């Protein structure tokens, strides 16, 4: 008898107890030990490596453990793979579809993503021994645009995407071996953790969910934005991550807490975030705000680091090195400019 | 330095002025790369290249000139005429070459993107430009001209300032006012739409209003002087007034970055720098 | 060594901008469109009327030696918040708007919101949109039949008349006329409201006749490229 | 009426396997992230100046 | 936690008064396009009504037109929707549908169901 308000019901009743559970554990906050750290101060980083070579707007990118190579994607058709350290573009892919919204470089760097309002997760090879690159893998399972897209081998690449739906692909056999459900809106973007053996997602609905790439289930879930998070990182530690939603306002959240640790407020901004990424150490905070700007936050003092000139657009795409050497910043300029 | 003071510093003021808008439209274009990407700021930046120009070895001969009477650099007097020449028609022309890829902009935008590329643009700046040299530097070598303030031959003057400007500003006008057809009937589209969904002049007179400043400003300054320039070989003008109009005809030369260089593009360029 | 490797990057770098330089012209030319409805509105009418033509992402096509690329979304989920601000940089967005299923739902006014939140977007203020009015002759039978009349979906076209620059048909009478160009006034209004002039809508009524639909995108894209070269020149 | 049914099902699933976890303090949990930042400050080469020698980009 | 709770509705006479509450908690409600989209049995998602983030631009679609009033409290955060003059078309459920993004007039929540921010809904029935 209204089997869907009384499990509804209880579903309150559960995220009520969530809540409680949550708070029980928050007798304080990220802020109470500010007192105990000392900030950086106001670093003002120029761009020491120019990367203007895209015809469109670059929507996204993604270092490389190198830490030498960045690819980059934008709505021209082309995705770019730039050397950061000579500026010299090292690859240039024709996309089967000019759109493309999402961009993961190999952890070995033989591989390359790619994906958009085509709903397919082109993988293409980048040390192939037939010269030009040429499609390794033609991933068609989403139903929905492809948003973000990270690698995690040779063989396994996971991909969030428009469909409410991730799904763990694999090159191999072109086939999602898992497929992690439970996202009400369009999910907007992914990270992996450094163990790699769970990644945390954020979607529209303003829920970060962390799920298991082994077990392929939901672990975690984090309800605590405002907006369509837009943009999500895992911190370099492993058991926490910074979400840039549309609300203008960042979240850090952490795994093991279950809830929010701060929220890097400002009145000056009022548009989303885009572009996420953490430092090599996690305490400044990449954020890449629709104001054509980028916001480098205190992770730890709760207060910007610093605001960088140079994008005149929107820009939609962040990168920080696995070693924090230089952050990579792709706008909606065609202009990748690399900070550090 | 009393009565010839105020002319001095007016014409210093004018000079720097000048030489103000041109390095910031150079800097503008030369370190950001979002004003020298698109090929429709190109030949607005050979016009700022020719200001440069014109800023830095035609403007300071005439200025220091004529706050006392005399003229250094006697040797290279008729050079410098040359270099006027090679700076003054070439702006014109950059001007006129402007209009032009300004009148493909608005006439046919599909075949000027299609046709008009950068290598194109290219090429019609490199016209311009040989085209001021070959009416510049080559009749100084062959001295078709006539302290050094004399009259030009009638046989080349008429045959310079025509193509100098007549000859662009006859391209400028039509092809402004084939602009100004264009962009009153696309307003007169705008106000079809616009009242029917609010069932006017206003934003019909700003192209003429930004017509009047982009090409009745470059006309009032030029051609003050250009009417002389042709009739002072065939005569009607004295030798303390015209060069008044010569220095009525380099003020283009100082709004040239305000009128060219105000969109919003080069607009946020200059906030910054 | 010091050169030997960098040198040969060197050059295919020199190969990849040559590429993106010859690539920079053609995606000058092919001017991207958005085509996009409310649902159901006509838009795979659309598609079959332009140039006689993996499912159905983007449909490309040519005249007067100017490309256009038209891309489809009939495809994509129910959400738009995201995957529409990929066309920023895209020329015209080509609204296919179904003049005639306001009565089923009322769909016009989902294609209001929808034209309201692209006019209204952060990123989707600087681009026009061609208002394709779709289903045009099913709207002659809709209105003068009284099967489905605006009073039910809009109280404003009690207090609508015929606006003097209506361009009649031959053979429609003036209610559906009325009824047609209310559609217009509709969505100019939203398009009116902004005032930015950034982007003006070009409302434009289709599949009443099976003549030539891309030569309708080809003279609204000329006249959208004019405008935007007229803003730029503050021309306009 | 049987999607919505399965979506809150799933809903309210993974609600239950959230609830059954291992909440740990926030003040724990803001020391751990504050001892790996300052375990890792002093090889960020974003967080301190890190001068043109060994920098690869200035 | 995004969450909008929408009470009030029931079973009224067609062509009395109803006034829909929609508590929003979770977020700033002085800064998003707060609006009510309602959902006929059987008939998809249909935009209703619409207020500005702080109450200029207020609108509504042609069926409730003149008749349903919008308006937003910034202080109690809460959307109230004024129903005068019931319709016999007008019965359906209700969403406290949010504009996805904050500080900006276009709001994609128009489009079908499973919506991030829509709340539960309220079954606004008529009577006959
Ligand atoms: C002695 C005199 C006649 C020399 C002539 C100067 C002319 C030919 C030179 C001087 C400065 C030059 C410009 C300098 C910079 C640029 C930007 C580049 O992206 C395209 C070419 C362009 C726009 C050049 C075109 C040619 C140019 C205008
Ligand atoms: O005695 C002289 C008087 C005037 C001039 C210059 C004046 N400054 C503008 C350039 C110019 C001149 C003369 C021309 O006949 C001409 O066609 C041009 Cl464009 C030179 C020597």
Redesign the pocket.
Same mark, same amino acid.
């Given at each position: 008898g209204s089997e869907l308000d009384q499990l509804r019901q209880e579903a309150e009743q559960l995220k009520n107890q969530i809540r409680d559970a949550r708070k029980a554990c928050a007798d304080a906050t990220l802020s109470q030990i500010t007192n105990n750290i000392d900030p950086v101060g106001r670093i003002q980083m120029r761009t020491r490596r120019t990367l203007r070579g895209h015809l469109a707007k670059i929507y996204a990118m993604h270092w490389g453990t190198d830490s030498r190579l960045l690819v980059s994607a934008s709505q021209d058709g082309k995705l770019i793979i730039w050397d950061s350290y000579t500026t010299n573009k090292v690859h240039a892919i024709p996309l089967r579809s000019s759109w493309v919204m999402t961009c993961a470089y190999a952890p070995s760097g033989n591989y390359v993503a790619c994906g958009g309002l085509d709903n397919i997760c082109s993988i293409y090879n980048l040390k192939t021994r037939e010269g030009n690159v040429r499609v390794s893998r033609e991933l068609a399972g989403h139903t929905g645009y492809l948003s973000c897209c990270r690698f995690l081998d040779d063989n396994q690449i996971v991909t969030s995407s428009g469909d409410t739906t991730c799904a763990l692909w694999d090159i191999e056999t072109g086939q999602q071996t898992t497929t992690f459900t439970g996202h009400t809106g369009d999910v907007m973007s992914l990270s992996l953790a450094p163990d790699t053996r769970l990644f945390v997602s954020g979607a529209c609905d303003a829920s970060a969910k962390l799920w298991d790439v082994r077990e392929g289930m939901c672990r975690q879930t984090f309800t605590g934005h405002e907006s369509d998070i837009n943009a999500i990182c895992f911190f370099p530690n492993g058991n926490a991550f910074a979400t840039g939603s549309d609300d203008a306002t960042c979240r850090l959240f952490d795994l093991r807490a279950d809830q929010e640790l701060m929220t890097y407020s400002h009145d000056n901004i009022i548009c989303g975030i885009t572009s996420v990424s953490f430092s090599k150490s996690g305490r400044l905070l990449l954020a890449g705000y629709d104001d054509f700007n980028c916001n480098v936050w205190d992770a730890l003092k709760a207060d910007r680091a610093g605001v960088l000139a140079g994008h005149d657009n929107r820009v939609s795409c962040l990168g920080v090195t696995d070693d924090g050497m230089a952050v990579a910043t792709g706008s909606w300029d065609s202009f990748l400019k690399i900070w550090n | 330095f009393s009565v010839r003071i105020l002319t001095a510093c007016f014409l210093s003021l004018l000079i720097l002025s000048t030489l103000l808008g041109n390095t910031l439209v150079c800097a503008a274009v030369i370190r950001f790369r979002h004003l020298r990407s698109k090929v429709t700021n190109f030949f607005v930046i050979s016009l700022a290249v020719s200001d440069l120009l014109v800023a830095v070895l035609?403007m300071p001969w005439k200025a220091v000139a004529e706050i006392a009477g005399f003229w250094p650099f006697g040797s290279f007097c008729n050079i410098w005429?040359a270099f @006027?020449?090679m700076? +003054?028609?070439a702006s014109?022309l950059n001007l006129c070459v402007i209009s032009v890829d300004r009148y493909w902009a608005i006439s046919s935008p599909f075949r000027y993107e299609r046709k008009m590329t950068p290598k194109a643009a290219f090429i019609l700046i490199s016209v311009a430009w040989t085209l001021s040299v070959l009416? +510049?530097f080559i009749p100084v070598q062959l001295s078709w001209?006539?302290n050094? @303030? +004399? +009259?030009?031959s009638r046989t080349?003057?008429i045959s #310079? #300032?025509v193509?100098? !400007?007549y000859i662009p500003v006859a391209i400028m006008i039509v092809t402004y006012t084939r602009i100004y057809r264009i962009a009153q009937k696309q307003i007169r589209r705008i106000a079809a739409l616009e009242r029917a969904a609010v069932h006017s002049f206003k934003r019909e007179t700003k192209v003429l209003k930004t017509l009047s400043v982009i090409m009745g400003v470059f006309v009032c300054c030029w051609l003050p !002087?250009?009417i002389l320039?042709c009739i002072?070989?065939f005569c009607c003008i004295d030798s303390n007034t015209? @060069?008044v109009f010569?220095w009525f005809?380099?003020a283009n030369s100082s709004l040239n970055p305000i009128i060219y260089a105000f969109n919003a593009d080069f607009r946020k360029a200059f906030s910054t720098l | 060594d010091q050169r030997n490797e960098e040198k040969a990057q060197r050059e295919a770098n020199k190969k990849i901008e040559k590429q993106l330089q010859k690539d920079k012209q053609v995606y000058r030319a092919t001017h991207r469109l958005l085509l996009l409805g409310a649902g159901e509105s006509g838009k795979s009418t659309i598609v079959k009327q332009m140039r006689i033509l993996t499912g159905i992402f983007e449909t490309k096509f040519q005249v007067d030696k100017v490309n256009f690329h038209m891309f489809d979304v009939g495809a994509q989920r129910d959400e738009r918040r995201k995957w529409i601000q990929c066309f920023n940089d895209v020329t015209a967005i080509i609204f296919v708007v179904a003049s005639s299923s306001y009565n089923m739902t009322n769909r016009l006014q989902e294609a209001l919101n929808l034209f309201k939140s692209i006019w209204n977007n952060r990123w989707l203020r600087t681009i026009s949109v061609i208002l394709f009015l779709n289903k045009q002759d099913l709207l002659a039978e809709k209105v003068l039949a009284g099967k489905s009349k605006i009073e039910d979906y809009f109280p404003e076209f009690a207090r609508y008349t015929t606006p003097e620059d209506a361009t009649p048909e031959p053979g429609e009478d003036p209610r559906v006329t009325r009824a047609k160009y209310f559609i217009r006034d509709e969505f100019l209004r939203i398009s009116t409201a902004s005032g930015d002039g950034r982007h003006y809508c070009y409302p434009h009524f289709t599949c009443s006749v099976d003549t030539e639909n891309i030569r309708r995108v080809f003279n609204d894209c000329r006249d959208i490229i004019q405008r935007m070269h007229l803003r730029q020149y503050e021309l306009l | 009426n049987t999607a919505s049914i399965a979506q809150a099902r799933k809903l309210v699933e993974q609600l239950k396997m959230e609830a059954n976890i291992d909440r740990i303090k926030v003040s724990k949990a803001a020391a751990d992230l504050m001892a790996y930042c300052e375990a890792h400050a002093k090889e960020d080469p974003l967080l301190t100046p890190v001068p043109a020698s060994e920098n690869p980009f200035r | 936690q995004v969450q909008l709770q929408e009470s009030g509705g029931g079973l009224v006479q067609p062509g009395g008064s109803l006034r829909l509450s929609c508590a929003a908690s979770g977020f700033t409600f002085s800064n998003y396009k707060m609006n009510w989209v309602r959902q006929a049995p059987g008939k998809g998602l249909e935009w209703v009504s619409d207020i500005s983030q702080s109450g200029a631009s207020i609108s509504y679609t042609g069926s409730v037109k003149g008749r349903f009033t919008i308006s937003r409290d910034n202080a109690k955060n809460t959307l109230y929707l004024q129903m005068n003059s019931l319709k016999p078309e007008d019965t359906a459920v209700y969403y406290c549908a949010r504009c996805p993004a904050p500080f900006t007039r276009d709001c994609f929540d128009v489009t079908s169901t499973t919506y991030a921010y829509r709340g539960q809904g309220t079954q606004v029935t008529v009577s006959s």
């Open positions: - | 035609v005429v @006027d020449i700076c +003054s028609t014109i009416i +510049s001209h006539k050094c @303030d +004399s +009259s030009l080349y003057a #310079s #300032s193509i100098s !400007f !002087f250009f320039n002072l070989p015209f @060069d010569v005809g380099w | - | - | -």
